[PDB]
């Protein structure tokens, strides 16, 4: 999209007032915020390392546009996955229970035994609390 | 339902005019025909072996009812699957083409690349003709 590309250019240019064609990689968090992201500490650490593999301290617009395109795609995918989580979690308990999963499978005409449904819970249930969190669901949706 | 349970009873009793409570297993084809099924030779061979695992040559009503309930449910799903087939095959060519699949994915809002759509054709295309027959579609659905 051309309008989104323009918005990304405008956010980059905020940090390049001198017109050098580069901005300090340390501005990434604020640049991302301008674009409506709120990246976590670990995410910033990883991105800065990925963007500036040569260690110069600087990024150009093409680098910035590539990463922001990636992040926008990832955000859209996340939001869609979270929409699906809510469709499982119809009781709004914040977790997908065996009950929610059984209900879904039945509703979608999918014939699964309790043993097969329990197996899906166990597969997703990384933290061992017997139900499926947003993070667990996110994880299993991207595999 | 009880209505159809009675049709099944009436079809059975056609072949038990002496009131023994059993009919010759050899009558299975004609009894199924009475109920509106036209089973193929391979299906009859299989059912007779399945129904008469002890080799007595006779079947009772409970066993007839069991097999007929299964055939009825199998028939209902086959017909629903072929309803979906016709929804893919909207050009009525009798095969689901790459074009048909792409159209369906688009109309349903599933973003599949040409590579992913081609993967789906290859998965279903057992006979190697580059398109998907009713038999292939039935297979890939009933699994």
């Amino acid at each position: 999209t051309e309008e989104q590309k323009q918005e990304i250019r405008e956010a980059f240019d905020l940090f390049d007032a001198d017109g050098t064609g580069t901005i300090d990689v340390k501005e990434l968090k604020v640049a991302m915020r301008a674009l409506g992201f709120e990246p976590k500490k670990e995410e910033i650490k990883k991105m800065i390392s990925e963007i500036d593999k040569e260690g110069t301290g600087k990024m150009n617009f093409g680098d910035f546009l590539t990463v922001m395109t990636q992040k926008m795609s990832e955000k859209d995918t996340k939001e869609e996955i979270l929409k699906a989580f809510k469709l499982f979690d119809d009781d709004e308990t914040g977790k997908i229970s065996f009950k929610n999963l059984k209900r879904v499978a039945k509703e979608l005409g999918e014939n699964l035994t309790d043993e097969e449904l329990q197996e899906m819970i166990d597969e997703a249930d990384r933290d061992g609390d017997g139900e499926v969190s947003e993070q667990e669901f996110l994880r299993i949706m991207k595999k | 339902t009880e209505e159809q349970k009675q049709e099944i009873r009436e079809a059975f009793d056609l072949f038990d005019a002496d009131g023994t409570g059993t009919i010759d297993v050899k009558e299975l084809k004609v009894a199924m025909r009475a109920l509106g099924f036209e089973p193929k030779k391979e299906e009859i061979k299989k059912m007779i072996s399945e129904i008469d695992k002890e080799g007595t040559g006779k079947m009772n009503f409970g066993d007839f009812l069991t097999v007929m309930t299964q055939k009825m449910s199998e028939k209902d799903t086959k017909e629903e699957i072929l309803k979906a087939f016709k929804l893919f095959d909207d050009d009525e060519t009798g095969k689901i083409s790459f074009k048909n699949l792409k159209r369906v994915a688009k109309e349903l809002g599933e973003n599949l690349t040409d590579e992913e759509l081609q993967e789906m054709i290859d998965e279903a295309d057992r006979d190697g003709d580059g398109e998907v027959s009713e038999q292939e579609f039935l297979r890939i659905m009933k699994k």
Binding site: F88, V104, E110, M141 | -
Partner: peptide, 17 residues
Amino acid sequence: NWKLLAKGLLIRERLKR
């Protein structure tokens, strides 16, 4: 299996107006 169900839910929801 998680994926099919999730996508099935999203497809159904989309199809409702």
